[PDB]
Amino acid sequence: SGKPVLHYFNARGRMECIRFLLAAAGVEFDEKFIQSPEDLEKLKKDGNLMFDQVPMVEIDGMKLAQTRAILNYIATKYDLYGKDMKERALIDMYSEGILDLTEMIMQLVICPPDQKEAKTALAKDRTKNRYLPAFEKVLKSHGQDYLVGNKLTRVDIHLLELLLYVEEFDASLLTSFPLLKAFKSRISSLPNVKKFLQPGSQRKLPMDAKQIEEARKIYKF
């Protein structure tokens, strides 16, 4: 088989979505966590990071970097990418929106303190007035269990991850989205997913004051 190797920080960051997808597909993976700048420098010095950056995943003889490129490969490989062109268009559109909101939430735990209140307010507004209504719309338009093609695809996993982050952010934001709540529960019950959600998995925890200061300098000046 050959167990994929994921190179990234001991953190969610951009690698988390990939971890989720792989776990969802029931594919066991090995991780090589960069603990120090020296490690990152070693990685780069090894010439396997196309743009001297991570995520980077070794799979099928390739040293694939670029989050989306990685997700994209895994999705097709395990058949979590729908059944055709139009389905993929929807999948892509939904996924991109998910990523955007994700980053938006991340920014919150990074923005210059004196400006937090406002940013939080915007992220919440956007969350409940722009994003959630959209996914709820999709779910409502067809009444089916999956977002696209009435079959499990990567976006279902992507949507789940985001909802979990929204729940950590502020759980009251999800209470006016019944279909999304039901969806969340459904996807969370999928064996592979349930397992990933269980403790002792490679699922990373949210960034903390100590494991945050390091990554700033470690970035590699």
**β strands within the chain, DSSP E:** 5-9, 30-34, 56-59, 62-65
Asked if residue 53 belongs to a known ligand binding site, the reply is yes
Pick the binder of ligand GTS from 13, 37, 133, 206 (CB under 6 A).
13
- DSSP one-letter code for 128: I
Asked if residue 54 belongs to a known ligand binding site, the reply is yes
Q: Are 74 and 25 in contact (CB under 8 A)?
A: yes
Q: Could you please report the per-residue DSSP string of 158-172?
A: HHHHHHHHHHHHHGG
Select 92 or 167, whichever has its Cβ closest to a copy of itself: 92
- Map residues 86-125 to x or -, x wherever contact with ligand GTS holds by CB under 6 A: ----------x---x-------------------------
CA 128 to chain centre: 19
Pick the binder of ligand GTS from 17, 18, 24, 54 (CB under 6 A).
54
Q: Give the amino acid at 1.
A: S
- Phi/psi of residue 7, nearest 5 degrees: -100, 115
Q: Measured between alpha carbons, how far is 197 from 193 in angstroms, rounded to an integer?
A: 6
Tokens representing 42 are 């070693």
Q: Measured between alpha carbons, how far is 83 from 178 in angstroms, rounded to an integer?
A: 28
Q: Which of residues 29-68 bind a copy of itself (CB under 8 A)?
A: 50-52, 60, 62, 64-68
220 binding partner (options ligand GTS, a copy of itself, none; Cβ < 5 to 8 Å by kind): ligand GTS
- Map residues 58-77 to x or -, x wherever contact with ligand GTS holds by CB under 6 A: --------xx----------
Q: What angle is formed at CA 28 by the lines to CA 214 and CA 95, rounded to 5 degrees?
A: 70
Q: Which of residues 107-166 bind a copy of itself (CB under 8 A)?
A: 130-131, 134
Q: For binding to a copy of itself (CB under 8 A), which residues are involved?
A: 50-52, 60, 62, 64-69, 72-73, 76-77, 85-86, 88-90, 92-93, 95-97, 100, 130-131, 134
Residue list for the binding site: 8, 44, 53-54, 66-67
Residues that bind ligand GTS (CB under 6 A): 13-14, 52-55, 66-67, 96, 100, 219-220
